[PDB]
Specification:
The chain has 3 helices and 7 strands. The chain has helices at 73-76, 92-104, 141-150; strands spanning 10-20, 35-44, 58-65, 79-86, 105-110, 122-127, 132-138. It is found in: Cytoplasm; Nucleus; Cell membrane; Cytoplasm, Perinuclear region.
């Protein structure tokens, strides 16, 4: 008798996703004081449940360009899929986030480095024309990050169709 905003999904684990305002990870000023964190709820199949007993409530998300997601083509499709629900209060607070992921950007989430917790990377995507969010949980986290950080290093290379 709690979070039942979904009809074809079941409450898995809700948490506050933090994310600052930044154009790209290449920006030298990537580290800003503008820290906008919005509440997100992760759902799953009927009955199904993930390992989130002592998981962190505050996750660190990073707004990155989708143009780089290409390098993670086979790395994306080969990942889990969940339902993300943003339950905030203010309007602009959330609307501002839509202007970001709405343009076509990916959200790389990472776990904290304080307590002993299984480090894992979770991708976030905004579904337009439906008003919903989909969470991508890639099995290979080590191969993901490496590619997400190396994708910007291979920017130099070019080519023409």
């Amino acid at each position: 008798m709690g979070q039942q905003s979904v009809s074809n999904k079941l409450l898995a684990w809700s948490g506050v996703l933090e994310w600052q305002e930044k154009p790209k990870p290449a920006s030298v000023d990537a580290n800003t004081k503008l820290t906008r964190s919005l509440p997100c709820q992760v759902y799953v199949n009927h009955g199904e449940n993930l390992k989130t007993e002592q998981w962190p409530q505050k996750l660190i998300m990073q707004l990155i360009p989708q143009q780089l997601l290409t390098t993670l083509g086979p790395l994306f499709r080969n990942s889990r899929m969940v339902q993300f629900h943003f339950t905030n209060k203010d309007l602009e607070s959330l609307k501002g986030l839509y202007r970001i992921m709405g343009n076509g950007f990916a959200g790389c989430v990472h776990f904290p480095h304080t307590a002993p917790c299984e480090v894992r990377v979770l991708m976030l995507l905004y579904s337009s024309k439906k008003k919903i969010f989909m969470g991508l949980i890639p099995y290979d986290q080590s191969g993901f990050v490496n590619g997400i950080r190396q994708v910007i290093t291979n920017h130099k290379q070019v080519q023409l169709e």
